[PDB]
Design a protein around this ligand. Structure first.
Ligand SMILES: Nc1ncnc2c1ncn2[C@@H]1O[C@H](COP(=O)(O)OP(=O)(O)NP(=O)(O)O)[C@@H](O)[C@H]1O
Ligand SMILES: [Mg+2]
Length: 329
C-alpha cells in the first residue's frame, strides 16, 4: 500500500496581498505546476499527485475544493480503511502558514470544519447506523502536542509534566501516561477536541513550532452466536498536523528528521526513526502496517517559491513510499 498524497493550495494571505503576490501555482487534473517568478522563462515544474485541491479562490467558484469535498475524498477513503480494520494515518505537511491546520481542524464554525472534525462525525454516524446487534463498538481518543521533542497531553492540561516516549518491548512506541479516553458520541469527542485545541500552545513568544497528533482507537467487536467468543477488530487512526517547515535546534529535529525518513523510505539500510519523537511514534505509519496519506499545504504566492517547491518535492517522494499492510483481526 503506497502512501497517498494530496496537495492543497489556499487563498492569498495578508502578507502576500500586501506584496502584490502573483499566483505561481496552477492545477489541472491531478497535475500541479509551479512557476518560478525569479526565472519566468525557465520551464515550469509539474508534479503528479493522487489528489489536487484548488482552494485558492472561494466556494462560489465551480472548481473550488471545499473542506467538505476534501474530506469526502481522502477523508472517507481513510475512514473506510479504518472500518476495514487497517491502521490509518493522515498528516498535513507544509510551509508555515500554508494551511495545515485549516485542512486538519478548520474552524468550528459554519461550513469550515477540517478533516479531523468531519471524520469523527462520520465515524460516529456510521456506528450509530449499525443494524447488526452482533456488532458493538468502542472509541477511545488521545490528543497530544510535540514541541522541542517534548510531549504534552492535550486532554489533560492539569498535568504540567511532559510525557515520556517509550518503546514497548513487544508492542512498539507509545507515550507513557497519555490519557486515552472513551467516548460514546460525536459531541463528546468534539468537546474533547475543542478542549484540546484551546490547550495547545501557540502563544506569541509567532508561528506554530509544535506538532499535534489526534489518535482514535476504533474497536469493532463481532459477537458469534453459538459459542461465546468475541473477535475484536482494532484500527488506530492517527491524524497529524505538523509545524510548518516554515519560511542546537531541538525545536525542529522532528521536522528535519521527518524529511530524512521520508527520503530514505522513498530510496528503499536503517532509518533514524529514533532521531526524533515525531518519527519514533509514527514509525509504523511511515514504513509500517498502516494506510498512510499525506496532505501537502501550499502557498499560492511567488514570494514563497523555494518553500513551496521544497514541499512539492517532499510530497513527490512520499508517493514513492510503500508499506506492507494487513487488517488487524
Ligand atoms: N482553504 C483555505 N480557505 C480559506 N482560508 C484558508 C485556507 N487554508 C488556509 N487558510 C487560512 O490561512 C491561514 C493559514 O492557516 P493554518 O492556520 O491553516 O496554517 P498552517 O496551519 O499553514 N500554519 P503554521 O502552523 O503557522 O505553519 C489561516 O489564517 C487560515 O484561516
Ligand atoms: Mg498550524
Amino acid at each position: 500500500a503506497s502512501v497517498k498524497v494530496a496537495v492543497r493550495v489556499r487563498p492569498f494571505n495578508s502578507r502576500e496581498m500586501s506584496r502584490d503576490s502573483k499566483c505561481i501555482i496552477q492545477m489541472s487534473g491531478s497535475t500541479t505546476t509551479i512557476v518560478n517568478p525569479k526565472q519566468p522563462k525557465e520551464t515550469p515544474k509539474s508534479f503528479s499527485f493522487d489528489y489536487s485541491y484548488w482552494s485558492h479562490t472561494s466556494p462560489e467558484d465551480i472548481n473550488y475544493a471545499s473542506q467538505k469535498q476534501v474530506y469526502r475524498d481522502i477523508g472517507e477513503e481513510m475512514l473506510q480503511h479504518a472500518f476495514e480494520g487497517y491502521n490509518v494515518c493522515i498528516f498535513a505537511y507544509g510551509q508555515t502558514g500554508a494551511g495545515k491546520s485549516y485542512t486538519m481542524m478548520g474552524k468550528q464554525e459554519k461550513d469550515q470544519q477540517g478533516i479531523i472534525p468531519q471524520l469523527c462525525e462520520d465515524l460516529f454516524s456510521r456506528i450509530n447506523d449499525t443494524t447488526n446487534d452482533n456488532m458493538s463498538y468502542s472509541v477511545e481518543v488521545s490528543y497530544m502536542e510535540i514541541y522541542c521533542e517534548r510531549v504534552r497531553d492535550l486532554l489533560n492540561p492539569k498535568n504540567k509534566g511532559n510525557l515520556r516516549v517509550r518503546e514497548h518491548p513487544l508492542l512498539g512506541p507509545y507515550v507513557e501516561d497519555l490519557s486515552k479516553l472513551a467516548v460514546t458520541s460525536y459531541n463528546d469527542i468534539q468537546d474533547l477536541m475543542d478542549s484540546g485545541n484551546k490547550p495547545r500552545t501557540v502563544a506569541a513568544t509567532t508561528s506554530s513550532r509544535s506538532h499535534a497528533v489526534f489518535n482514535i482507537i476504533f474497536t469493532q467487536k463481532r459477537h458469534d452466536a453459538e459459542t461465546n467468543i468475541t473477535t475484536e477488530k482494532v484500527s488506530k487512526i492517527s491524524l497529524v498536523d505538523l509545524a510548518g517547515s516554515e519560511r542546537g535546534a531541538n525545536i525542529n529535529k522532528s521536522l528535519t528528521t521527518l524529511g530524512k525518513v521520508i527520503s530514505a523510505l522513498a530510496e528503499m539500510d536503517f532509518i533514524p526513526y529514533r532521531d526524533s519523537v515525531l518519527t519514533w511514534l509514527l514509525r509504523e505509519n511511515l514504513g509500517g502496517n498502516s494506510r498512510t496519506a499525506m496532505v501537502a499545504a501550499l502557498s499560492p504566492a511567488d514570494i514563497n517559491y523555494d518553500e513551496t517547491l521544497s514541499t512539492l518535492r517532499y510530497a513527490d517522494r512520499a508517493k514513492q513510499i510503500r508499506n506492507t499492510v494487513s487488517v488487524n483481526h
